[PDB]
Every structure is written in C-alpha cells, then in structure tokens.
Amino acid sequence: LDSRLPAFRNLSPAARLDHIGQLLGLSHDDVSLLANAGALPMDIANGMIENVIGTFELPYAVASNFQINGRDVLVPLVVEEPSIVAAASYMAKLARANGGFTTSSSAPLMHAQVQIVGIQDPLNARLSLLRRKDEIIELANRKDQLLNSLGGGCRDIEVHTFADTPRGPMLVAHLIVDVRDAMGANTVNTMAEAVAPLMEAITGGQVRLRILSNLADLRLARAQVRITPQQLETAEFSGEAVIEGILDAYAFAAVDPYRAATHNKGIMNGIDPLIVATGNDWRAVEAGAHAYACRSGHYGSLTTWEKDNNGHLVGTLEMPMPVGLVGGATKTHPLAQLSLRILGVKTAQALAEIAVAVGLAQNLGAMRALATEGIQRGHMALHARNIAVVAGARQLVEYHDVRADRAVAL
C-alpha cells in the first residue's frame, strides 16, 4: 500500500473514499458504510449507553503519508478541530524521507488494584501477600482460562503500603496482567474481584476497591522520528535555526507546566481522534498520558526533542497506550471495525504503536509552526469558515488576516 494519497487535500469526500477503497480493496458494502450516514444503527446506539435520544456525528478523516517500521499505513481520525489532520499528514510526509516512524511496544500489561483496610499491620500484611503470590496469581488465572490460552494472564503481583493516611493504614495490591488485544478494564477487574477473598484471608483485613489503574505505565508504546535541517528551511528561516527554535520550545515545555499542558494537549490532538475512530475509550488514554507526564514529581513533556551527531532533529514519544481491538465498543461500532480494517492492525499493541507515531507527528507539527511563522497563519486559514459564521467571506480572510473584526468589516 502507498499512503501518500496524491491530491487528497483537494479531492471531494466521495473521491477520497473511492481512492481509499481502491488502495485497500474495500468491498462496495464497506464503502457504503462511509458513503451514507447512519452506520451506527439506533438499536446498537440505544444498547451502548443509557437515555439515548439519537446519535451525534463528527467528521471522519484520513491522515496521509504515515509509515510505521517501513510499512505505509492509512490513519483514520475523528475530531472537530481544523488543521490537526493537515499537520499530521505534513509531518508524516517529512518523516518518510528519513525512514518514517520507528516504533515498538511493551507487553500489554495492566494493573488491577486491590485496596485493603482495617489492619493495624499493613507492612507485615504486605509480606504475607508476597509470600503467597503464586497462590494469588494462580487464583487470578483460574478466573480466565481463555486469556491464558491466548498468551495473556496474570504475570505477577506488587504490593504497596500507605501506613499513615488521614483515614488510617492502607495496603494496595496490584495484579499485573497481560490482557492481549483488550484495553483490559473488565478483564482485570474480574481478577481483582476473584482474589479479594483470598487477600482478606491472608492479611486479616477488609478489601474495599477492586479496580484497574488507568496509570498504565507497564503498557508502553514508543515512537521515534528524524527530520533534517533542509526539510525545515523556510524563506525566512534556515533549517538549522528552526531546529534550534524547536529545541528552545522543548526546553520551555520541560521547565514550565503552563507550557507542558499545551504541548501535551497538542500530542493528544493526534492521538484521541484515532482512539475515537477505533471505538476506544479516550478518557482512559488521556488519564494515562497526563498522569505519566508527572511521574517525576514535575508535570513535563511526553515527547523528547534533541539534535543528533549529524545535526538532525530527533524526537521520541514513549507513553502508556491502553487500547483494544476487542472489548468495549471496538467490535460494536461498524465504523470502529472499518477503521481497524483501514489501519490493517492485527494486535492491540500494533494500534498502540500507530497512536504514538501520530502523537509524535502531531507535536512536531505544532512546534514547527510555533518556532517559525507562528501557529495562526496555517491554522486560522483552515478555521476561516468558522470565523465567517461566528461573525454572522472565508476566501477573503485567507489573505492572511482571519479575524472576526476583519470578517465584520467585509
């Protein structure tokens, strides 16, 4: 497959869809799911959440140029904000010239928390649990034989203590569970419930919360990118100057949480729409992302940006990325299934790797604009329709002055 998508930006939605259909060999019925509204039937929507009165659409787009470990990939994105898809496609275009994005991921390990209270000896109780960890792990795995046959299952436990809280001593056991192609929530919650009575017997305490942690720091996905100065040169700025500016932007994010929040928001502009497109839980991914960003005791940047020994700009993104191909609404939504088909992913960790490549590209796009002509020239041009509506035209403002004041005057 070739993901360059020639002239995609200027094709109609229908023509874009036909091209995508041809590249992938989509059936007429697959294409019909995007060519017509209503792919999520009301009986499905009504069964997904409560008090349903209809459905709500967001645009479904495809970012171009992405390449993951040498293979071209098409990336579906669902979001309401302009310039995101364009920026991601642009930075992916640049990345192609230098090998695309290089990615990897850890095993899909999730934490299941079991909170224990009502004991005066939590530090001792912790050792009692660790002494009998095999028995606990076996009980957890008895509860899900299928997962174990699929190559997943509870691998280990860790135990943490909070002996002095304002509500008294607490002990917290974590089951560490390989959840294969699931996000993992229902899978691990069931194991936490199963081990609870055994943990009460071992410790003499009372189990309270049995629940996954969204701080999924053992389920990491990683992306790398490289950009050369010749690629970043503009009429106003040398490529070398742009790279230095991007490093200045990165250091700013690393020291100031007011910047880091926005910097990381820019990453999630790329990631969350891929999560939505695949029927996955975007709140979970957001919580894992931002909590991980403060793991040091300072809220910093999820990405890294440096200059290598050849003067090239090199970036990384390593972060928690709990996603599924099964579970939740990933199988329920016909377009979630179509998105997975478009992506070509065969494991959840493969989707996770695409997600961090997109987030890395997204961050790069923001920083490149910010370090050069500023964010407004390119972004507001694609927002110009919205400005015309707010004012009460779009082509005229595209003369580099997209402001409501100007729209009012015209």
Ligand X SMILES: CC(C)(COP(=O)(O)OP(=O)(O)OC[C@H]1O[C@@H](n2cnc3c(N)ncnc32)[C@H](O)[C@@H]1OP(=O)(O)O)[C@@H](O)C(=O)NCCC(=O)NCCS[C@@H](S)C[C@@](C)(O)CC(=O)O
Ligand Y SMILES: NC(=O)c1ccc[n+]([C@@H]2O[C@H](COP(=O)([O-])OP(=O)(O)OC[C@H]3O[C@@H](n4cnc5c(N)ncnc54)[C@H](O)[C@@H]3O)[C@@H](O)[C@H]2O)c1
Ligand Z SMILES: C[C@@](O)(CCS)CC(=O)O
38 binds a second copy (CB under 8 A): yes
Distant-in-sequence, close-in-space partners of 242: CB < 8 Å, separation ≥ 6: 229, 232, 233, 234, 368, 371, 372
Min separation Cβ 81 and ligand X, Å: 6
Residue 281 among the catalytic residues: yes
Per the listing, tokens 């008895």 go with 142
- Residue 365's binding partner among ligand Z, ligand Y, ligand X, none (Cβ under 5 to 8 angstroms by kind) is ligand X
- 305 - beta bridge partners? 315
State how far the Cα of 124 lies from the Cα of 131, in Å rounded to an integer. Answer: 11
- Residue 163's contacts (CB-CB under 8 Å, 6 or more residues apart) are 122, 123, 169, 170
| Active-site residue, 174 included | no
Backbone angles phi, psi at 316, to 5 degrees: -130, 155
**What element of type H or E holds 141?**
helix 133-142
- Which member of 65, 141, 187, 372 binds ligand Y (CB under 6 A)? 187
Stretch that binds ligand X, among 38-46, 238-246, 298-306, 372-380 (CB under 6 A): 372-380
Q: Which of 68, 95, 276, 321 binds a second copy (CB under 8 A)?
A: 276
Considering only the stretches 10-18, 42-50, 85-93, 141-149, report the one whose residues sit in contact with ligand Y under the rule CB under 6 A.
141-149
Print burial letters for 230-264: b (CB count within 10 Å at least 16), e (below 16): ebbeeeebebebbbbbbbebbeebeeeeebbeebb
Side chain identity at residue 125, one-letter code: A
Q: Is 211 in the site for a second copy (CB under 8 A)?
A: yes
Give yes or no for residue 50 binding ligand X (CB under 6 A).
yes
Token duo for residue 338 = 């179509």
For the CA atoms of 400, 406, 409, 410, what is the dihedral angle to 10 degrees? 40
Looking at 11-19, 72-80, 262-270, 313-321, which segment touches ligand Z (CB under 6 A)?
262-270
**266 is a site residue for ligand X (CB under 6 A):** yes
Residue number with CB closer to ligand X (214 or 339):
214
Quick one: which of 89, 113, 337, 349 contacts ligand X (CB under 6 A)? Answer: 89
Residues 325 to 344 in contact with ligand Y, rule: CB under 6 A: 326-328
55 and 42 in contact (C-beta within 8 Å)?
yes
81 catalytic residue (yes or no): yes
Determine if 184 is a binding residue for ligand Y (CB under 6 A). Answer: yes
User: Exactly one of 69, 98, 104, 190 binds a second copy (CB under 8 A); which one?
Assistant: 190
Which entry of ligand Z, ligand Y, ligand X, none binds 89, CB below 5 to 8 A by partner kind?
A: ligand X
Is 308 in contact with 226 (CB distance < 8 Å)?
A: yes
Is 366 near ligand Z (CB under 6 A)? Answer: yes
Closest by Cα among 351, 63, 379 to 182: 351
| Residue 156 annotated as catalytic | no
Cα distance between residue 20 and residue 244, in whole Å: 38
Among 3, 224, 269, 372, binds ligand Z (CB under 6 A): 269
Q: Is residue 259 near ligand Y by the rule CB under 6 A?
A: no
Instruction: Choose which of 4, 132, 133, 208 interacts with a second copy (CB under 8 A).
Output: 208
Neighbours of 129 (CB within 10 A): 22
**Rounded Cα–Cα distance for residues 223 and 213 (Å):** 23
Stretch that binds ligand Y, among 32-40, 117-125, 292-300, 386-394 (CB under 6 A): 386-394
Annotated catalytic residue within 30, 181, 281, 318: 281
Q: Which residues bind ligand Y (CB under 6 A)?
A: 81, 144, 146-147, 150, 152, 179-187, 189, 212, 214, 262, 265, 281, 284, 324, 326-328, 386-387, 390, 404
Q: Which residues form the catalytic set?
A: 81, 265, 281, 379
